[PDB]
Write a protein that binds this ligand. Structure first.
Ligand code: ARS
Length: 147
């Protein structure tokens, strides 16, 4: 049940293999940079001992993650076809073997992110921060947009 998946995400910080196709989770915080204990109380302190959200083999196709924090997230072998990842924070994220076909990553931050063997066919990466981003083995095509 979706309710159970959301619980595992909020509490267990994971949802391996979950089916989250088309979910609407914009502006959420699934990263390791900050925490909100009043949405301005946001602070990085207290994150020294926190685990990264695990979404290995998860299906987030066509899901909306607009402006969500996904820093250090684990999306290994995840399915993200046509997913809205624009303006998301994917710093140090693990996207090994991820399927990002037709995904929208506009203005997303991918610093230190690992996208080895990831599929970027038709994906849009305009304005993306590729500083120290591992792009070894990625797949692209005439539809892949970089600018
Ligand atoms: As190609």
């Amino acid at each position: 049940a979706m309710t159970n998946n959301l619980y595992r995400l909020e509490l267990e910080r994971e949802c391996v293999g979950c089916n989250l196709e088309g979910v609407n989770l914009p502006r959420e915080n699934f990263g390791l940079k900050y925490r909100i204990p009043s949405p301005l109380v946001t602070t990085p302190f207290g994150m020294d001992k926190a685990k990264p959200v695990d979404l290995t083999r998860a299906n987030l196709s066509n899901a909306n993650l607009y402006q969500s924090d996904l820093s250090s997230i684990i999306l290994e072998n995840a399915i993200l076809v046509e997913t809205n990842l624009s303006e998301t924070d994917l710093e140090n994220a693990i996207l090994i073997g991820a399927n990002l076909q037709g995904a929208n990553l506009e203005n997303a931050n991918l610093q230190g992110a690992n996208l080895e063997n990831a599929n970027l066919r038709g994906a849009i990466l305009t304005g993306v921060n590729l500083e120290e981003t591992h792009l070894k083995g990625i797949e692209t095509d005439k539809n892949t947009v970089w600018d």
